Design an enzyme around this catalytic site. Structure first.
Site, PDB file in Angstrom:
ATOM      1  N   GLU A 135       7.174 -17.384 -60.747  1.00 14.10           N
ATOM      2  CA  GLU A 135       7.169 -18.799 -60.395  1.00 14.10           C
ATOM      3  C   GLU A 135       6.958 -19.683 -61.616  1.00 14.10           C
ATOM      4  N   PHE A 173      -5.784 -16.298 -45.708  1.00 16.56           N
ATOM      5  CA  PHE A 173      -4.937 -15.416 -46.498  1.00 16.56           C
ATOM      6  C   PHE A 173      -3.948 -16.225 -47.327  1.00 16.56           C
ATOM      7  N   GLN A 174      -3.902 -15.940 -48.633  1.00 18.04           N
ATOM      8  CA  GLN A 174      -3.062 -16.679 -49.583  1.00 18.04           C
ATOM      9  C   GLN A 174      -3.306 -18.182 -49.491  1.00 18.04           C
ATOM     10  N   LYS A 225       2.999 -23.985 -42.900  1.00 17.75           N
ATOM     11  CA  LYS A 225       3.989 -23.122 -42.263  1.00 17.75           C
ATOM     12  C   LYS A 225       4.359 -23.623 -40.872  1.00 17.75           C
ATOM     13  N   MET A 240       2.116 -19.431 -85.587  1.00 19.25           N
ATOM     14  CA  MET A 240       1.435 -20.708 -85.785  1.00 19.25           C
ATOM     15  C   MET A 240      -0.077 -20.525 -85.869  1.00 19.25           C
TER      16      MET A 240
HETATM   17  C1  LIG Z   1       0.113  -8.031 -47.823  1.00 16.46           C
HETATM   18  C2  LIG Z   1      -1.374  -7.958 -47.414  1.00 16.46           C
HETATM   19  C3  LIG Z   1      -1.736  -7.438 -46.164  1.00 16.46           C
HETATM   20  C4  LIG Z   1      -3.088  -7.371 -45.791  1.00 16.46           C
HETATM   21  N1  LIG Z   1      -3.440  -6.859 -44.576  1.00 16.46           N
HETATM   22  C5  LIG Z   1      -4.752  -6.426 -44.397  1.00 16.46           C
HETATM   23  C6  LIG Z   1      -5.149  -5.472 -43.284  1.00 16.46           C
HETATM   24  O1  LIG Z   1      -4.315  -5.052 -42.505  1.00 16.46           O
HETATM   25  N2  LIG Z   1      -6.463  -5.071 -43.140  1.00 16.46           N
HETATM   26  C7  LIG Z   1      -7.426  -5.532 -44.007  1.00 16.46           C
HETATM   27  O2  LIG Z   1      -8.580  -5.176 -43.874  1.00 16.46           O
HETATM   28  N3  LIG Z   1      -7.080  -6.429 -45.058  1.00 16.46           N
HETATM   29  C8  LIG Z   1      -5.733  -6.875 -45.253  1.00 16.46           C
HETATM   30  N4  LIG Z   1      -5.393  -7.745 -46.280  1.00 16.46           N
HETATM   31  C9  LIG Z   1      -6.398  -8.252 -47.131  1.00 16.46           C
HETATM   32  C10 LIG Z   1      -7.157  -9.417 -46.446  1.00 16.46           C
HETATM   33  O3  LIG Z   1      -6.515 -10.649 -46.731  1.00 16.46           O
HETATM   34  C11 LIG Z   1      -8.633  -9.453 -46.975  1.00 16.46           C
HETATM   35  O4  LIG Z   1      -8.638  -9.137 -48.297  1.00 16.46           O
HETATM   36  C12 LIG Z   1      -9.448  -8.440 -46.228  1.00 16.46           C
HETATM   37  O5  LIG Z   1      -9.617  -8.828 -44.863  1.00 16.46           O
HETATM   38  C13 LIG Z   1     -10.785  -8.360 -46.892  1.00 16.46           C
HETATM   39  O6  LIG Z   1     -11.809  -8.182 -45.947  1.00 16.46           O
HETATM   40  P1  LIG Z   1     -13.277  -8.023 -46.581  1.00 16.46           P
HETATM   41  O7  LIG Z   1     -14.190  -9.111 -46.002  1.00 16.46           O
HETATM   42  O8  LIG Z   1     -13.827  -6.646 -46.239  1.00 16.46           O
HETATM   43  O9  LIG Z   1     -13.158  -8.146 -48.141  1.00 16.46           O
HETATM   44  P2  LIG Z   1     -14.006  -9.105 -49.037  1.00 16.46           P
HETATM   45  O10 LIG Z   1     -13.381 -10.479 -49.082  1.00 16.46           O
HETATM   46  O11 LIG Z   1     -14.092  -8.531 -50.457  1.00 16.46           O
HETATM   47  O12 LIG Z   1     -15.494  -9.199 -48.432  1.00 16.46           O
HETATM   48  C14 LIG Z   1     -16.375 -10.244 -48.907  1.00 16.46           C
HETATM   49  C15 LIG Z   1     -17.553 -10.278 -47.945  1.00 16.46           C
HETATM   50  O13 LIG Z   1     -18.517  -9.289 -48.323  1.00 16.46           O
HETATM   51  C16 LIG Z   1     -19.770  -9.994 -48.479  1.00 16.46           C
HETATM   52  N5  LIG Z   1     -20.608  -9.341 -49.401  1.00 16.46           N
HETATM   53  C17 LIG Z   1     -20.402  -9.124 -50.692  1.00 16.46           C
HETATM   54  N6  LIG Z   1     -21.446  -8.459 -51.201  1.00 16.46           N
HETATM   55  C18 LIG Z   1     -22.355  -8.240 -50.200  1.00 16.46           C
HETATM   56  C19 LIG Z   1     -23.626  -7.616 -50.074  1.00 16.46           C
HETATM   57  N7  LIG Z   1     -24.224  -7.032 -51.182  1.00 16.46           N
HETATM   58  N8  LIG Z   1     -24.246  -7.596 -48.874  1.00 16.46           N
HETATM   59  C20 LIG Z   1     -23.684  -8.144 -47.826  1.00 16.46           C
HETATM   60  N9  LIG Z   1     -22.490  -8.745 -47.889  1.00 16.46           N
HETATM   61  C21 LIG Z   1     -21.813  -8.805 -49.048  1.00 16.46           C
HETATM   62  C22 LIG Z   1     -19.391 -11.341 -48.909  1.00 16.46           C
HETATM   63  O14 LIG Z   1     -20.440 -12.289 -48.652  1.00 16.46           O
HETATM   64  C23 LIG Z   1     -18.245 -11.598 -48.025  1.00 16.46           C
HETATM   65  O15 LIG Z   1     -18.699 -11.979 -46.722  1.00 16.46           O
HETATM   66  C24 LIG Z   1      -4.072  -7.820 -46.663  1.00 16.46           C
HETATM   67  C25 LIG Z   1      -3.707  -8.343 -47.922  1.00 16.46           C
HETATM   68  C26 LIG Z   1      -2.361  -8.412 -48.293  1.00 16.46           C
HETATM   69  C27 LIG Z   1      -1.972  -8.979 -49.665  1.00 16.46           C
HETATM   70  C1  LIG Z   2       2.846 -26.911 -82.244  1.00 22.26           C
HETATM   71  C2  LIG Z   2       3.169 -28.396 -81.971  1.00 22.26           C
HETATM   72  C3  LIG Z   2       3.202 -29.316 -83.027  1.00 22.26           C
HETATM   73  C4  LIG Z   2       3.496 -30.666 -82.780  1.00 22.26           C
HETATM   74  N1  LIG Z   2       3.533 -31.560 -83.811  1.00 22.26           N
HETATM   75  C5  LIG Z   2       4.212 -32.761 -83.619  1.00 22.26           C
HETATM   76  C6  LIG Z   2       4.686 -33.622 -84.777  1.00 22.26           C
HETATM   77  O1  LIG Z   2       4.481 -33.277 -85.925  1.00 22.26           O
HETATM   78  N2  LIG Z   2       5.352 -34.809 -84.542  1.00 22.26           N
HETATM   79  C7  LIG Z   2       5.595 -35.222 -83.252  1.00 22.26           C
HETATM   80  O2  LIG Z   2       6.180 -36.267 -83.051  1.00 22.26           O
HETATM   81  N3  LIG Z   2       5.159 -34.434 -82.148  1.00 22.26           N
HETATM   82  C8  LIG Z   2       4.466 -33.194 -82.337  1.00 22.26           C
HETATM   83  N4  LIG Z   2       4.045 -32.423 -81.262  1.00 22.26           N
HETATM   84  C9  LIG Z   2       4.253 -32.882 -79.945  1.00 22.26           C
HETATM   85  C10 LIG Z   2       3.184 -33.936 -79.557  1.00 22.26           C
HETATM   86  O3  LIG Z   2       2.055 -33.294 -78.988  1.00 22.26           O
HETATM   87  C11 LIG Z   2       3.800 -34.942 -78.525  1.00 22.26           C
HETATM   88  O4  LIG Z   2       4.625 -34.264 -77.683  1.00 22.26           O
HETATM   89  C12 LIG Z   2       4.599 -35.976 -79.263  1.00 22.26           C
HETATM   90  O5  LIG Z   2       3.745 -36.828 -80.028  1.00 22.26           O
HETATM   91  C13 LIG Z   2       5.331 -36.788 -78.244  1.00 22.26           C
HETATM   92  O6  LIG Z   2       5.388 -38.140 -78.623  1.00 22.26           O
HETATM   93  P1  LIG Z   2       6.213 -39.078 -77.612  1.00 22.26           P
HETATM   94  O7  LIG Z   2       5.299 -40.207 -77.120  1.00 22.26           O
HETATM   95  O8  LIG Z   2       7.418 -39.662 -78.337  1.00 22.26           O
HETATM   96  O9  LIG Z   2       6.723 -38.192 -76.420  1.00 22.26           O
HETATM   97  P2  LIG Z   2       6.515 -38.515 -74.905  1.00 22.26           P
HETATM   98  O10 LIG Z   2       5.169 -38.016 -74.437  1.00 22.26           O
HETATM   99  O11 LIG Z   2       7.626 -37.845 -74.086  1.00 22.26           O
HETATM  100  O12 LIG Z   2       6.614 -40.108 -74.696  1.00 22.26           O
HETATM  101  C14 LIG Z   2       6.165 -40.674 -73.442  1.00 22.26           C
HETATM  102  C15 LIG Z   2       6.077 -42.177 -73.662  1.00 22.26           C
HETATM  103  O13 LIG Z   2       7.366 -42.771 -73.474  1.00 22.26           O
HETATM  104  C16 LIG Z   2       7.186 -43.805 -72.478  1.00 22.26           C
HETATM  105  N5  LIG Z   2       8.375 -44.031 -71.762  1.00 22.26           N
HETATM  106  C17 LIG Z   2       9.040 -43.191 -70.982  1.00 22.26           C
HETATM  107  N6  LIG Z   2      10.127 -43.805 -70.498  1.00 22.26           N
HETATM  108  C18 LIG Z   2      10.163 -45.083 -70.987  1.00 22.26           C
HETATM  109  C19 LIG Z   2      11.017 -46.214 -70.869  1.00 22.26           C
HETATM  110  N7  LIG Z   2      12.154 -46.143 -70.076  1.00 22.26           N
HETATM  111  N8  LIG Z   2      10.714 -47.354 -71.528  1.00 22.26           N
HETATM  112  C20 LIG Z   2       9.642 -47.423 -72.277  1.00 22.26           C
HETATM  113  N9  LIG Z   2       8.805 -46.390 -72.423  1.00 22.26           N
HETATM  114  C21 LIG Z   2       9.039 -45.224 -71.798  1.00 22.26           C
HETATM  115  C22 LIG Z   2       6.095 -43.322 -71.630  1.00 22.26           C
HETATM  116  O14 LIG Z   2       5.475 -44.400 -70.909  1.00 22.26           O
HETATM  117  C23 LIG Z   2       5.173 -42.793 -72.646  1.00 22.26           C
HETATM  118  O15 LIG Z   2       4.434 -43.860 -73.249  1.00 22.26           O
HETATM  119  C24 LIG Z   2       3.757 -31.094 -81.485  1.00 22.26           C
HETATM  120  C25 LIG Z   2       3.724 -30.168 -80.421  1.00 22.26           C
HETATM  121  C26 LIG Z   2       3.430 -28.823 -80.666  1.00 22.26           C
HETATM  122  C27 LIG Z   2       3.400 -27.821 -79.504  1.00 22.26           C
END
Ligand SMILES: Cc1cc2nc3c(=O)[nH]c(=O)nc-3n(C[C@H](O)[C@H](O)[C@H](O)COP(=O)(O)OP(=O)(O)OC[C@H]3O[C@@H](n4cnc5c(N)ncnc54)[C@H](O)[C@@H]3O)c2cc1C
Ligand SMILES: Cc1cc2nc3c(=O)[nH]c(=O)nc-3n(C[C@H](O)[C@H](O)[C@H](O)COP(=O)(O)OP(=O)(O)OC[C@H]3O[C@@H](n4cnc5c(N)ncnc54)[C@H](O)[C@@H]3O)c2cc1C
Ligand SMILES: Cc1ncc(C[n+]2csc(CCOP(=O)(O)OP(=O)(O)O)c2C)c(N)n1
Ligand SMILES: Cc1ncc(C[n+]2csc(CCOP(=O)(O)OP(=O)(O)O)c2C)c(N)n1
Ligand SMILES: [Mg+2]
Ligand SMILES: [Mg+2]
Lengths: 582, 582
Positions: free
Chosen positions: B59, B121-122, B171, B485
């Site tokens: 992503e 979840f997520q 969702k 760099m």
């Molecule tokens: C694709 C996918 C599918 C999934 N399907 C399942 C599934 O089918 N079944 C499943 O179980 N999970 C599934 N999960 C995972 C699920 O989202 C959770 O991670 C899962 O339910 C974790 O349950 P848990 O509470 O045991 O884990 P945890 O989140 O790790 O448990 C944390 C809990 O333990 C407590 N705790 C920590 N330490 C202590 C301590 N010393 N004493 C007392 N309490 C403590 C915390 O306070 C908290 O309440 C899936 C995940 C994915 C990515």
């Molecule tokens: C390793 C590294 C080195 C760098 N060294 C340099 C360097 O030496 N020199 C350098 O220049 N940059 C350098 N930078 C980049 C620097 O951090 C900035 O990105 C740079 O200063 C951008 O300047 P800018 O304002 O022109 O760009 P921008 O941030 O894109 O300018 C945005 C500005 O334009 C305005 N604006 C947008 N549209 C309009 C519009 N239609 N009318 C009026 N205003 C508008 C916005 O309001 C804003 O004020 C470096 C970056 C890195 C990663």
């Protein structure tokens, strides 16, 4: 008695105070990617003779490596990044460490204090961005706050319900000279006032009391029991209650045991879900009642007395209101209940053999099954072979998708902290970097990444990190050439209408794309591809026996479906038990 | 007169309303990665016969592709992701699109409305996370708000100072049936009330008045002039003022022109910075006075009358207080000043030949130089060859680092929207995905990604997207085997002490690692590697002539330094003009 590299009266850079603050926390490994805002930290990192840095190829890989380091050891995982784009690449890992309650400490560089708010170069308010996806975060405004903030960060990240803690450090603070004070107390009054006390003996007896009065009890074990492996194993000895684990609790109670119900939930086994549905007592230890486990909450354990034990008082009664509740460490609650069960062994009947033999009927009637089509490799069977060839003693990290469920279903994890997977956030590409941190935390351990072709490619850049750091990471790639889990939902609910789920080349459908072997070859990693079931056993054996890293491209038919399945928001009477995409 | 795929009285899904809302905005290409929360959108995306989806492999690559699509065309870039980890992977692109003012619209899926806040979840609060890194964001709470929110999103993202706008769609809203109302007005009263009016004729005359009274004027052109290529080209005809462009304004005024001062700032040419330092009138059109351009603000144009023109009233007087200020479209301000200069051509002297021939003295005394060591390829020379072989008519996207500056210094961009680079956030891995979106937006254009070995590997997964979508993306990889760099700052200020900046394998230092050719080979892309300067011209010519994608691994000595250089927070009298890491 810590030994510093500086005199107690000698001024040192702020970055030197930061690194020493990590050394005083017992940090042995960090995952840092350098940048302009954190160059002072990276400079002071080289002056440390005890902190090893694993340089990733992407900060998302750095934080995921810190998770696998943490998840596979219980220690806190420490990742470091620079300001701006370096910090924004940690966002997925921070939200992941929060939802799965993983102890993690992230240190990001930042522009000098005099420039915060001017939309400066590489300037993003990472503290405001990560406030809702971190347990807590900080913004260091003075070099003298470095020892206190770091101590508060590690304490917050590890104590109670663990989570990620971010520490934003401006560049000028890293350069400012100072003499640190390591004896200043932590400013956490209301946090520590809320830390749960050891459970009262009154609560534990009524729970033991409800066990003897119950006829159909079920253990609902989750991620909170990863530190109670022995305490939970003894608790089931004295009660004989079947154990249903979550995606996160896998390994807390051995899956190969006769009392194990394996996983419950949406993709949990039929007999585990049946036990919870038709239970009268539900012991929910270390769980959070996720929607992926309960479905429709009114149908979850509708005829069961719910006993909920948690260290987070916010989870108690959050989604499902329990009968009895205990706010504290489940490790202590088990220790207290254990010595109550053995001292009252004669008083309590405790023989649920009628109930577990009722479940064993469902265990043989509806077990975990998979079809084998010709010589095409069943992904379930491939994971079952890895279990046999590793004796279930291999640290397993996975991505997210179909392969993630099959790695949870068809592997018998014997101990906790062996199963590393993104369950809460469900972040793809978690597998390969998590195996990196797990291999560093457990050098002599068999570390295997059961990844998917979609998840593996997302953080494929970390293959270079594996070779450079010479880590024996095994990659069991289950290549289905599809976004499998999304493809399965298309077959079930959208009439198999493909909506951007194919990952190969449409100009050559029957050609496996991409050639993941050349990905390993680009990073000097030996690789192989197996397609036929007969060659599967030797191929996995070759991967394990070959020293160092190894990638195995296991080709699987894409029409496979993860079974069983409960649709989102359903009940137990909605479980799908058969069907695929053929 | 738009033609819908649905009857005006026919209920349709919310996702169908969303896709049709994009069709009504003229959207031809989206960059969507599917997931459980956005599957309804992806389903309705296939029902559209006018919206093409480029499926990325990450992503972060999807949003970066939307940036290159936007940056290389002026149209808004649209990327779509799912909830949780899909949305958190857009964070780097959203903060990038904000700091560089790139018109972008991000659509993320979300859990049903009934589940927001339960840490489901997520489930991550993407709106709260992206509030400080987006121009504006939304959370759709009813299916009937879809046409209004999408119209407000595209209007906000494109009008005024462009930026990213996120639209979080639950969702259940995607599934809810409804009849959309396309005629409901936008709820943006205070935004439109603040939209700048056309500039008054009084302001423009005093600016023209100050031009004739000034003896040493300098044009400070930036990213705000990308739509005023012709208007700015005519303005310099009537005044003869030398033009100093920013990293973002490159291409607004041709670099090959005799009046061009090329880039100013930290890594800007000596003669451009000299012009601003010793100017009496500074025409700052479309700039924001970044710290990478000014350094110490008190020394920036300390003897110059500053005229600042902006469409963002917040940038005026933000870092440097100007004499005269104009809040409006610089395109209109140039049109008004142009017809004032030609109608008063005889009244105004307008002959700065004494001033520009004073600058041309510095232009030949301190020009852009580079050393050539034996047959080792100078990265500057390699980019100069690409300029010659493409006639400066190739769309150039870059990563971030040394190669980014050399692509800006040694390429003569003739038109705007030809130079795609992350300047504000400075996000690595921006190059390869930006070239993907630029090639889709300009199919018949020479699209070349001048990437670095560190930046290229971060989003190397998008090579599969290039082959699958059959995009003629050229990858001119400047492989220095280092985090260049950052390595340069180590040589200058840290006594060349390497702190995790080497990207190759330490077990084989003289071997180029990773073998990027096998990365292209894994994705079925033809690749080649050149090491000697003699073979450089034919190798680049082969890359251009070969149809489709192509990767050229150009090996460069790592000891090269980007020159000239002004340390962070310095003045013009602190410019470093010579030196490297040898
Ligand atoms: C694709 C996918 C599918 C999934 N399907 C399942 C599934 O089918 N079944 C499943 O179980 N999970 C599934 N999960 C995972 C699920 O989202 C959770 O991670 C899962 O339910 C974790 O349950 P848990 O509470 O045991 O884990 P945890 O989140 O790790 O448990 C944390 C809990 O333990 C407590 N705790 C920590 N330490 C202590 C301590 N010393 N004493 C007392 N309490 C403590 C915390 O306070 C908290 O309440 C899936 C995940 C994915 C990515
Ligand atoms: C390793 C590294 C080195 C760098 N060294 C340099 C360097 O030496 N020199 C350098 O220049 N940059 C350098 N930078 C980049 C620097 O951090 C900035 O990105 C740079 O200063 C951008 O300047 P800018 O304002 O022109 O760009 P921008 O941030 O894109 O300018 C945005 C500005 O334009 C305005 N604006 C947008 N549209 C309009 C519009 N239609 N009318 C009026 N205003 C508008 C916005 O309001 C804003 O004020 C470096 C970056 C890195 C990663
Ligand atoms: C970064 C990210 N994007 C999208 C999703 C939604 N998602 C969950 S599983 C899946 C498909 C993954 O397929 P794959 O990684 O190849 O494993 P497979 O199911 O094919 O075995 C997707 C896209 C996600 N969890 N994370
Ligand atoms: C994601 C990200 N991490 C870190 C930085 C800080 N940074 C800026 S340039 C650079 C080194 C990049 O080296 P490379 O990509 O190989 O280009 P080179 O300078 O070597 O030519 C780094 C790490 C950044 N801009 N973005
Ligand atoms: Mg897969
Ligand atoms: Mg490089």
């Amino acid at each position: 008695t810590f030994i510093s590299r500086f005199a107690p009266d000698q001024p040192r850079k702020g970055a030197d105070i930061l690194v020493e603050a990590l050394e005083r926390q017992g940090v042995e490994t960090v995952f840092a990617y350098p940048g302009g805002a954190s160059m002072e930290i990276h400079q002071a990192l080289t002056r440390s003779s005890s902190i090893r840095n694993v340089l990733p190829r992407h900060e998302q890989g750095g934080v995921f490596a810190a998770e696998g380091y943490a998840r596979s050891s219980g220690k806190p995982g420490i990742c470091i990044a620079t300001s701006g784009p370096g910090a924004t690449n940690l966002v997925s890992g921070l939200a992941d460490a929060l939802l799965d309650s993983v102890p993690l400490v992230a240190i990001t560089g930042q522009v000098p204090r005099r420039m915060i708010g001017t939309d400066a170069f590489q300037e993003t308010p990472i503290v405001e961005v990560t406030r809702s996806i971190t347990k807590h975060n900080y913004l260091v405004m003075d070099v003298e706050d470095i020892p206190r903030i770091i101590e508060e960060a590690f304490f917050l990240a590890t104590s109670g319900r663990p989570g990620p803690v971010l520490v934003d450090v401006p560049k000028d603070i890293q350069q400012q000279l100072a003499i640190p004070n390591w004896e200043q107390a932590m400013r956490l009054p209301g946090y520590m006032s809320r830390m749960p006390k050891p459970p009262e003996d009154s609560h534990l007896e009524q729970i033991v009391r409800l066990i003897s009065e119950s006829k159909k009890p079920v253990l609902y074990v989750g991620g909170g029991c990863l530190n109670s492996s022995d305490e939970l194993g003894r608790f089931v000895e004295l009660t004989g209650i079947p154990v249903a684990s979550t995606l996160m609790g896998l390994g807390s109670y051995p899956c190969d045991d006769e009392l194990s119900l394996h996983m419950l939930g949406m993709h949990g086994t039929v007999y585990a879900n049946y036990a919870v549905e038709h239970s009268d007592l539900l012991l929910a230890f270390g769980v959070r009642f996720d929607d992926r486990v309960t479905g429709k909450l009114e149908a979850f354990a509708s005829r069961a007395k719910i006993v909920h034990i948690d260290i987070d008082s916010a989870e108690i009664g959050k989604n499902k209101t329990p009968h009895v509740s205990v706010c504290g460490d489940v490790k202590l609650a088990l220790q207290g209940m254990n010595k109550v069960l053995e001292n009252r062994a004669e008083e309590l009947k405790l023989d649920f053999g009628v109930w577990r033999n009722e479940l064993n009927v469902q265990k043989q009637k509806f077990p975990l099954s998979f079809k084998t089509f010709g010589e095409a490799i069943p992904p379930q069977y491939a994971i079952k072979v890895l279990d046999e060839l590793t004796d279930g003693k291999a640290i397993i990290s996975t991505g997210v998708g179909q392969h993630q469920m099959w790695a949870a279903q068809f592997y018998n994890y014997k101990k906790p902290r062996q199963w590393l997977s993104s369950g809460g956030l469900g972040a793809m590409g978690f597998g390969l970097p998590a195996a990196i941190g797990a291999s560093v935390a457990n050098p002599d351990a068999i570390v295997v990444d059961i990844d998917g072709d979609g998840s593996f490619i997302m953080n494929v850049q970390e293959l270079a990190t594996i070779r450079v750091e010479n880590l024996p990471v095994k990659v069991l790639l289950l290549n289905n050439q599809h976004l499998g889990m999304v493809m399965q939902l298309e077959d079930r609910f959208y009439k198999a209408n493909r909506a951007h789920t194919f990952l190969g080349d449409p100009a050559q459908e029957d050609e496996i794309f991409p050639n993941m072997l050349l990905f390993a070859a680009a990073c000097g990693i030996p690789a192989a591809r197996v397609t036929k079931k007969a060659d599967l056993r030797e191929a996995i054996q070759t991967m394990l026996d070959t020293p160092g890293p190894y990638l195995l491209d296991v080709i699987c038919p894409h029409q496979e479906h993860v079974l069983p399945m409960i649709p989102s928001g359903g009940t137990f009477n909605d479980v799908i038990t058969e069907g695929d995409g053929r």
